[PDB]
Symmetry: C3
Subunit: 283 residues, 3 copies
């Protein structure tokens, strides 16, 4: 399936009919997150299997439901699990859900993920506001946009220099200062590693040389598709482990540890995002 205007519209119209929601804000829940979903008011749950051409989640900690409803007076659509390129899906399959969000009316997209810390300061449980990225697949001819351009969504050559909206980062940090957890909040550059192997110790050391603060296997594809069709983005990494110090201590990383960190910070991440949604500009 191609992520074109026609197929995106078919999916959006199904969602519109079954949920009756026209959302302004979209949300993506990373590995093991999805406690925000219990706070949605007047909610409607739509399994991905019922949506025309929507792919199935295959990773632990990614529930395949779309949830719509009200949060902080605003209407939202939330992905309770995301798709990843290491699963074997094509760039058209990864791009489709974001283009459905565009046609539903989404103007601001709030993204979460779990990631490894590269910067030596970062420890398990910390948050990183993403301010830029290094797209290793994109440099090496696996960019999500390789192929015919879908002109109804955006330009052949998008500029990514404001992909991570500056005012949204400032707002997120202001709310953290207001509630006295600004000591958990950093800003940083996100490296996209295709995966599914964790970074080797020498790959982590290289990323540190190159100026990356965190590394993970998601997010950059969706961010580029959002930027291409004019959707503003805020992206936050929850740090699962520090890869540099782990390698020095011969400490292993595994997906069970990742899911446990997500469970320990999910309530706070839910509160933070609810307040950001509430304070977003009405335009």
């Amino acid at each position: 399936v191609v992520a074109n205007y026609e197929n995106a519209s078919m999916a959006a119209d199904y969602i519109k009919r079954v949920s009756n929601v026209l959302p302004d804000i979209g949300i993506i829940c990373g590995s093991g997150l999805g406690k925000l979903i219990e706070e949605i008011e007047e909610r409607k749950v739509i399994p991905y299997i019922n949506i025309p051409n929507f792919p199935k989640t295959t990773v632990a900690g990614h529930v395949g439901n779309l949830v719509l409803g009200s949060v902080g007076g605003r209407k939202i659509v939330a992905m309770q699990g995301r798709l990843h390129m290491y699963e074997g899906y094509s760039n058209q399959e990864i791009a489709l859900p974001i283009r459905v969000m565009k046609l539903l009316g989404v103007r601001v997209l709030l993204i979460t993920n779990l990631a490894g810390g590269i910067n030596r300061k970062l420890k398990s449980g910390d948050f990183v506001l993403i301010k830029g990225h290094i797209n290793f697949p994109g440099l090496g001819l696996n960019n999500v946009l390789v192929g015919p351009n879908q002109d109804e969504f955006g330009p052949r050559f998008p500029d990514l220099s404001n992909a991570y909206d500056r005012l949204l980062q400032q707002l997120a940090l202001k709310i953290a200062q207001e509630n006295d957890f600004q000591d958990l909040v950093h800003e940083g550059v996100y490296a996209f590693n295709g995966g599914p192997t964790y970074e080797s110790p020498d790959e982590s050391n290289m990323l540190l040389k190159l100026g990356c603060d965190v590394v993970g296997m998601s997010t950059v594809p969706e961010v580029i598709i959002a930027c291409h069709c004019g959707i503003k983005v805020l992206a936050v990494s929850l740090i699962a482990n520090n890869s540099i110090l782990d390698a020095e201590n011969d400490v292993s990383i595994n997906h069970e540890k990742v899911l446990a960190v997500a469970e320990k910070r999910a309530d706070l991440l839910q509160m933070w995002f609810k307040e950001i949604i509430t304070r977003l500009p009405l335009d």
Copy 2:
């Protein structure tokens, strides 16, 4: 379609029949260039659509015609637009036109492109004689030569250490000194980014750390196919923008700005290449 001896020969024989030219020199015009095409004497224009298995150009500023004729007493074949891997074409489709040039008799290939400047010295309108490259797709398993080797054209494992002919660079610079525009001429390393997104600010900063002087989305595939079958290469980047200073000033890049820079320098680039063609060694 496979870029093998049989399919390359079919295309070359069509061209030979319709144009009656046996060219020694090949030319590739980058984005928005193609004013050299009006200086071709006794010219023959062949649309790509008429040539067996030739792909169609889909990018603005790339006209899909092959032009043959005389320049400076020598016989040439010029591509009035080029194919790019971000368009969705396979490595066999990108390689085919160069192997057609080989069978037509081409021994020297002169390449142009539009690119972003990484080196802080470079500004819009400058020229960079390419002296080497960093092939990010090739490092990451998307090299143009991955696949069965076509033995009639070259070796399984080509050496690229003289891919950019030293004496051609020296000749190009000598003519620029002769005509007092050597202050516009630099030498540099070209980074191949698959595209189609422009480099993010943090990707540009990384390229600067790694020793690259310019970055673009073309050229390295054709250069490797030429080197594989023994064709000498000169490659020149026309700088569209400086990506490092742009990111610092929050200045955006777009394809319209790219095409305008190409139009402002096209007459000089045409004069330069005509003189290089005229001065090339008769062997």
Copy 3:
């Protein structure tokens, strides 16, 4: 063909039936190596063409036979040539022979390859015990494990921090000290370049900046598949050339020089590996 439990079992059962060997140790011979094959006692030779779904070797210096027998009292299975991703094979085709080894009973895998030296100290004929790697295809979405996970062999997200067993490296170096060729033995980080072009001079210079000691076009795929299914690995590079000093001297590299270096060191590499096999722990 998919490298799943069923297809791996079919191949393993054929081998078991025709050879009658249940091997504990697996071996892979790199370009132009394969003199260890004459030292196998009570040996059985099985051409790859007879094994269900085994691919054919297409590179010079890679004989397509599996050899089983006794060495140093232990039972082994040796690949007399290996498959490479630059040949055009899929990640399922490259992974299959390692998963066959797993089902045959292999617990320790000893790997050889020919490579370019990056570290300025390394010269033709030297050996490098590999202690880590930088997987450029893996960073850029061409990891050997992209796709559905084959759960019978290992986890969705493998940790690679002990992929190169520390005690095996120590044992290999101890035997070299015992026999007074420790001056030929180094330790280093291996960069995986997809190929098939040799590294350009500027790519070699970049690898040196990034902390790599050697570069080649193999090994990292098999190492990840082995680590995924719990097989311990020792990997040794035989240095064919120093790419940094070659570029400075305008000295070319070619596959004939590679094969000649392999022939000059094959007897010593055979003796070394026989002694390592003999001294391996019985668990």
